[PDB]
């Protein structure tokens, strides 16, 4: 309540709606385009990279485990990020300098589960596909 | 309520339903007008000419008695004041407050009153200017305005 209601006040309503519409966070991040600037992906869905080392990260307090993530250096723009490796026993397959392919967790830039500070997951290694290699549908080329 | 206040009073006067003179008035419109013109030349403004005639002798409503308005009579007889009486009194009051203020430098309350009075003068002058009683180039300049009143 308290809006202008006259028949010639369309400008005030349009200006107020445009100004107050910035308080939304999804729209504010859309207008400023942080994905184009700050996001590791240049507003894309996937990205290609080079594996540098394998690192283990401890789970949060209620849980207790080592999640066995991995370090990756991006080919597209050369910055270095950390990504997760899922399922079980997959760490053996991915060697050093293996040209991995990455994707998101679906949390849209936020940590998933008890895994701290990891926003990406490995989809392919040596261009074969992790899940297909896991089920022994293919053999990793040397 | 009011332009510069918080009061909500309703004190006023109620005009009777009848628009005809009482049967005991026995005064013609032709005779009555000369008392108005004599008093106007003696110096009384239209504001209290009506109240003095009303209290002293006879006429209660000049409009009902003569069919014409009181100010209109003076204007048609060439006795209308050059400036309206309400603006004249507002100017006089603003001058008197300014005169007190210059002696009393730190009366912040009278300074506040003066801002309201001048803003009311400007608002009323805008109406008179846009209706044509005063010339469009008339301006309220505070320095020599004291001569207009007297």
């Amino acid at each position: 309540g308290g809006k202008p209601r006259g028949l010639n006040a369309a400008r005030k309503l349009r200006n107020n709606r445009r100004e107050q519409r910035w308080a939304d966070l999804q729209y504010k991040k859309r207008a400023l385009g942080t994905a184009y600037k700050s996001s590791p992906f240049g507003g894309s869905s996937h990205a290609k990279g080079i594996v540098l080392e394998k690192v283990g990260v401890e789970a949060k307090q209620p849980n207790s485990a080592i999640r066995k993530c991995v370090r990756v250096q991006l080919i597209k723009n050369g910055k270095k990020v950390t990504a997760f490796v899922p399922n079980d026993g997959c760490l053996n397959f991915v060697d050093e300098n293996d040209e991995v392919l990455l994707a998101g967790f679906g949390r849209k830039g936020k940590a998933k589960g008890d895994i701290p500070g990891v926003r990406f997951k490995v989809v392919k290694v040596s261009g074969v596909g992790l899940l297909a290699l896991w089920k022994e549908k293919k053999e990793k080329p040397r | 309520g009011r332009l510069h206040s918080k009061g909500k009073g309703i004190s006023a006067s109620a005009i009777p339903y009848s628009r005809n003179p009482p049967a005991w008035l026995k005064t013609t419109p032709e005779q009555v007008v000369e008392q108005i013109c004599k008093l106007a030349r003696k110096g009384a403004t239209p504001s209290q000419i009506g109240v003095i005639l009303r209290d002293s002798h006879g006429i209660a409503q000049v409009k009902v008695v003569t069919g014409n308005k009181i100010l209109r009579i003076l204007k048609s007889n060439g006795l209308a004041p050059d400036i309206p009486e309400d603006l004249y009194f507002l100017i006089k009051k603003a001058v008197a407050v300014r005169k007190h203020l210059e002696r009393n430098r730190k009366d912040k309350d009278s300074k506040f009153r003066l801002i309201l009075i001048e803003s009311r003068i400007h608002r009323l002058a805008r109406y008179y200017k846009t209706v044509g009683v005063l010339p469009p180039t008339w301006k309220y300049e505070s320095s020599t305005a004291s001569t207009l009143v007297a």
Partner: protein
């Protein structure tokens, strides 16, 4: 200050009827108000009404007989073509069978159903059902 004497009249009628009174008093009276009352009367929603004539503006005293649910006013007078007039009846009427929306047109102010019969449009001023 007073910006809608029509709104004041309908609000006072609605309050008295909802609280169960039988008579209503309206301080300002106007031609649009009386023309609205005649429309209500022609459909039986009210009874006698009287306009006392003081020289200022006159007053209104309406006689109620129940049977009235609500009567409201739309304050911004929109412009409605004839083709979209059914949007409003879909919007602010409980059902199409009964209820009336009051319009103002070049042929006087009138309800939306015979106004449709007259094949005319104009501006919207209120409603009652």
């Amino acid at each position: 200050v007073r910006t809608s004497v029509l709104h004041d009249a309908l609000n006072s009628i609605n309050n008295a009827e909802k609280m169960g009174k039988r008579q209503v008093m309206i301080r300002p009276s106007s031609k649009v108000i009386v023309k609205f009352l005649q429309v209500m009367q022609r459909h039986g929603y009210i009874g006698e009404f009287e306009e006392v004539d003081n020289h200022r503006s006159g007053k209104i005293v309406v006689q109620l007989n129940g049977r009235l649910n609500k009567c409201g006013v739309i304050s911004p007078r929109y412009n409605v073509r004839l083709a979209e007039l059914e949007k409003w009846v879909t919007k602010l009427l409980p059902a199409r069978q009964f209820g009336y929306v009051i319009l103002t047109t070049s042929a006087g102010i009138m309800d939306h159903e015979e106004a449709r019969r007259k094949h005319v449009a104009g501006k919207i001023i209120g409603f009652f059902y």
